[PDB]
């Protein structure tokens, strides 16, 4: 009547055998989980990575959150220790409900969350130790360093240790040399009751995986990848200010929005309470949001499998159409892998090869098109050496790598080959095609991949 909880997302309890390789398991559940956007994974009962930290030596400054449905917030936006945050968090929840914190039913905190965010008269604010970069404060998982206990050593090399998962073989973001520290390094989240994360999808439509180390549950809502644009259409009509164009990736606009609103518009939505020791996995382009039930501690990281590669290319195209900034060049990543074809996993090699083929056929067509526009002069250019802000298309902000157009008239400016007419007002013959590779360089790179794929 007031809040109708979405149906539960899938929950998986893998045997030790299935659990042994996370990527195999994720590929296995994919047909199910991608229909719901998020899923929950319970590790085998004895898989218990030790969390050990001094609650007095980790400091952080949390984000302040107003709890206001449809109100805009920035995706990335007073000082606490873990102990002092915990004391604040427990007292807040305790005083809010006038009860002990583990007597407050999760269904009631959920009902109450959606009540207070929709009520203008309430101005509840909370704090969230969010997007704490694990570089400074350190992972909740064991990492190599002082001296580690034998049980910690058991978990050092686990695939499910979220420090490992980025840099494993079945992962694609591994051999990226470019700076993508926002997508390779785990983030830490210190939650309190009602602290929340707005509806979003991951950069470049990657997967994500979120582990709750300890504390009270984290409540999730998720939408499957296929419904991403449905969700966005619903959201555009109700909160169009979220969809205005805007510079940098440091300001993307996001919001809290009731799942029942989406369900009313026939957008499929699923839910779960993630408890301590459980993983949530989000699939490519799966919108998700949620809130914490109480004091807790989670750790999350992005990753990319071979399944994702074509979506990665589609995302960058979609970014271009939106005039949105890229975190990295997808083509640059593909070529880097091609250049390391001999040491690639063979299934990876085979999949990169397929994407590269499309890349090369698209590049060929784009180059013919700009030649017919009267761009004649050309010069090779090592795009990967340019800082990103020095190789974005003036028009669509895409990060150039395969090629770009420059002009003597507007020195330093580039456009991608889609936006040749947007570079300057000089005639075409004054333009130059800057290219990383000739077509003849490219076919051997692809063929290296083919030999490796056998």
Ligand X SMILES: O=C(O)/C=C/C(=O)O
Known binding positions for Fe cation: 200, 202, 288
Of 393, 404, 420, 449, which lies in the binding site for Zn ion, with binding defined by CB under 5 A? Answer: 393
Listed residue (122, 140, 127, 132) closest to 69, CA to CA: 122
Which residues have a Cβ under 8 Å from the Cβ of 337 and sit 6 or more positions away?
Answer: 172, 175, 344, 348, 352, 449
Between residues 68 and 210, which has the closer beta carbon with respect to ligand X?
210
Provide, rounded to whole angstroms, the least separation between the CB of residue 216 and ligand X.
13
> How many chain residues are in contact with Mn ion, going by CB under 5 A?
4
Q: How many CA atoms lie within 13 A of 426 on its CB side?
A: 15
Q: Does 419 bind Zn ion (CB under 5 A)?
A: yes
Q: Does 324 bind Zn ion (CB under 5 A)?
A: no
Of 56, 122, 151, 153, which lies in the binding site for Mn ion, with binding defined by CB under 5 A? Answer: 122
Binding mask 172-211 for Mn ion (x = CB under 5 A): ------------------------------------x---
Q: Positive or negative CA dihedral for 369, 370, 375, 378?
A: negative
Where does the chain break, by residue before each gap (C–N > 2.5 Å)? 77, 145
How many residues comprise the chain?
Answer: 454
Which residues have a Cβ under 8 Å from the Cβ of 8 and sit 6 or more positions away?
Answer: 270, 271, 272
| Footprint of ligand X (CB under 6 A) | 130, 189, 197, 208, 210, 218, 298, 300
Provide, rounded to whole angstroms, the least separation between the CB of residue 283 and ligand X.
12
Stretch that binds Zn ion, among 6-14, 129-137, 154-162, 418-426 (CB under 5 A): 418-426
Binding site for 2-oxoglutarate, by residue number, is 128, 208, 210, 218
Between residues 10 and 310, which has the closer beta carbon with respect to ligand X?
10
Q: Does 423 bind Zn ion (CB under 5 A)?
A: no
Provide, rounded to whole angstroms, the least separation between the CB of residue 377 and ligand X.
47
Helices (H) and strands (E) in the chain, counts: 12, 19
Between residues 80 and 431, which has the closer beta carbon with respect to ligand X?
80
Binding mask 84-113 for Mn ion (x = CB under 5 A): -----------------x------------
Listed residue (224, 218, 227, 226) closest to 280, CA to CA: 218
Q: To the nearest 10°, the Cα dihedral for 175, 177, 183, 184?
A: 60
Tell me which H or E stretch contains 351: helix 346-371
What residue 170 binds from Zn ion, ligand X, Mn ion, none (CB within 5 to 8 A, per partner kind)?
A: none
Of 327, 349, 396, 446, which lies in the binding site for Zn ion, with binding defined by CB under 5 A? Answer: 396
Provide, rounded to whole angstroms, the least separation between the CB of residue 304 and Zn ion.
24
- The DSSP letter of residue 250 is S
Provide, rounded to whole angstroms, the least separation between the CB of residue 317 and ligand X.
24
> How many chain residues are in contact with Zn ion, going by CB under 5 A?
6
The single residue listed with the structure tokens 């899938």 is 10
Between residues 196 and 351, which has the closer beta carbon with respect to ligand X?
196
Provide, rounded to whole angstroms, the least separation between the CB of residue 417 and Zn ion.
8
Query: Nearest-CB residue to Zn ion?
Result: 393
Provide, rounded to whole angstroms, the least separation between the CB of residue 6 and ligand X.
17
- To 10 degrees, what angle do helices 346-371 and 439-453 make? 160
80-81 and 59-60 strand pairing:
antiparallel
Q: What is the largest CA-CA distance in the chain?
A: 76
Provide, rounded to whole angstroms, the least separation between the CB of residue 324 and Mn ion.
6
Would residue 249 be called left, alpha or beta, if left means φ above 0 and alpha means ψ between -120 and 50 degrees?
alpha
Report whether 36 contacts 12 (CB < 8 A): no
Between residues 126 and 356, which has the closer beta carbon with respect to ligand X?
126
What residue 210 binds from ligand X, Zn ion, Mn ion, none (CB within 5 to 8 A, per partner kind)?
A: ligand X
Report whether 398 contacts 320 (CB < 8 A): yes
Which parts of this chain interact with Zn ion (CB under 5 A)? 393, 395-396, 416, 418-419
Which parts of this chain interact with Mn ion (CB under 5 A)? 68, 101, 122, 208
């Amino acid at each position: 009547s007031m809040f109708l909880p979405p149906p539960e997302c899938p929950v998986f309890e893998p045997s030790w055998e299935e659990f042994a390789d996370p990527f195999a398991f994720i590929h296995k559940i994919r047909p199910i989980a991608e229909q719901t956007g998020i899923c929950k994974v319970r590790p085998p009962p004895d898989w218990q990575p030790p969390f050990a930290c001094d609650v007095d030596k980790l400091h952080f400054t949390p984000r302040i959150q107003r709890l206001n449905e449809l109100e805009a917030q920035t995706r990335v936006k007073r000082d606490y220790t873990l102990r002092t945050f915990g004391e604040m968090a427990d007292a807040f929840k305790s005083d809010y409900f006038n009860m002990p914190v583990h007597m407050v039913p999760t269904e009631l905190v959920e009902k109450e969350f959606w009540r207070l965010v929709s009520t203008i008269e309430e101005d509840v604010t909370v704090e969230y130790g969010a997007d704490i970069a694990s570089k400074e404060f350190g992972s909740g998982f064991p990492v190599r360093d002082i001296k580690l206990s034998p049980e910690e050593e058991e978990y050092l090399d686990s695939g499910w240790n979220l420090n490992n998962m980025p840099v494993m073989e079945q992962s694609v973001l591994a051999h990226i040399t470019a700076d993508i520290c926002g997508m390779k390094l785990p983030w830490l989240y210190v939650g309190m009751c009602f602290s929340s994360f707005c509806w979003h999808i991951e950069d470049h439509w990657s997967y994500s995986i979120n582990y709750l180390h300890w504390g009270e549950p984290k409540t999730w809502y998720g939408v499957p990848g296929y419904a991403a644009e449905q969700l966005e259409n619903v959201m555009k009509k109700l909160a169009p200010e979220l969809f205005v164009s805007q510079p940098d990736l440091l300001h993307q606009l996001v919001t809290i929005m009731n799942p029942n609103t989406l369900m009313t518009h026939e957008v499929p939505v699923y839910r779960t309470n993630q408890c301590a020791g459980e993983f949530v996995i989000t699939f490519p382009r799966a919108y998700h949001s949620g809130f914490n039930q109480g004091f807790n501690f989670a750790e999350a990281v992005n990753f990319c499998t071979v399944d994702w590669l074509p979506l990665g290319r589609q995302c960058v195209e979609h970014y271009r159409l939106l005039h949105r900034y890229c975190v990295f060049s997808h083509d640059e990543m593909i070529c880097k892998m091609a250049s390391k074809a001999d040491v690639l996993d063979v299934v990876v090699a085979s999949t990169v090869q397929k994407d590269m083929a499309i890349m090369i056929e698209d590049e060929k067509a784009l180059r013919e098109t700009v030649r017919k526009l009267g761009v004649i002069d050309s010069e090779r250019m090592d795009f990967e050496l340019l800082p990103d802000d020095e190789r974005q298309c003036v028009k669509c902000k895409t990060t150039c790598f395969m090629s770009a157009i420059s002009c003597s008239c507007k020195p330093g400016l580039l456009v991608c080959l889609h936006h040749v007419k947007e570079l300057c007002s000089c005639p075409p013959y004054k333009y130059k095609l800057r290219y990383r590779y000739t077509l003849d360089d490219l076919y051997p790179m692809m063929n290296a991949l083919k030999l490796r794929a056998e």
